[PDB]
Amino acid sequence: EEASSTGRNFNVEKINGEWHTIILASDKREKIEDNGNFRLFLEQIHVLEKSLVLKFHTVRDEECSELSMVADKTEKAGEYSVTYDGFNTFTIPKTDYDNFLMAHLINEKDGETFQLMGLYGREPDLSSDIKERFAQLCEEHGILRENIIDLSNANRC
Ligand code: NA
Ligand code: NA
Ligand code: NA
């Protein structure tokens, strides 16, 4: 069964645990390119009463650097906010809990904005069918495939 974080039947406890960054996408491609601040490799999501603790690592010159962020629930169900390289809010438009998680985030910094979409998997990779479903979801948000980057062969330290 699939759900959206903004849907009535969403069960946030079910996204707890191990996750891996499979694909990242953005309408500002530089943000997820090699030295981008949003080229983030997820490791786990810890679900709390009104927050999610996100554990990630970034990579630079082949060196991994850990980072944790706390995302707080906002006034809208299914929406979380977090301060990181500006102000971010995000939702999970689609997850099946057991294989994949698709997130949609809006970043605002210095009076600007951009959209970030991420495809996360329970294992370090996902099937081609799930990756195509993600490309379709990015298209629905106006993000071209040329701005979608598969990081499945670069998500391990
Ligand atoms: Na730039
Ligand atoms: Na694989
Ligand atoms: Na579509």
Query: Any idea which fold 1-157 has?
Result: Lipocalin (2.40.128)
Closest ligand to Cα 153 = 2
C-alpha to C-alpha distance for 101 and 81, rounded to whole angstroms = 17
Q: Is 80 helix (H, G, I), strand (E, B) or coil?
A: strand
Q: What spacing in Å lies between the alpha carbon of 103 and ligand 1's midpoint? A: 24
The dihedral sign for the CA sequence 149, 36, 53, 140? negative
Q: Report domain extents, the chain.
A: 1-157
Torsion of CA 6, 114, 150, 133, to 10 degrees: 40
Q: What spacing in Å lies between the alpha carbon of 156 and ligand 2's midpoint? A: 12
Q: How was this structure determined?
A: X-ray
Amino acid in the structure at residue 6: T
Closest ligand to Cα 152 = 2
Instruction: For residue 54, give the nearest of 76, 39, 74, 69 by alpha carbon.
Output: 69
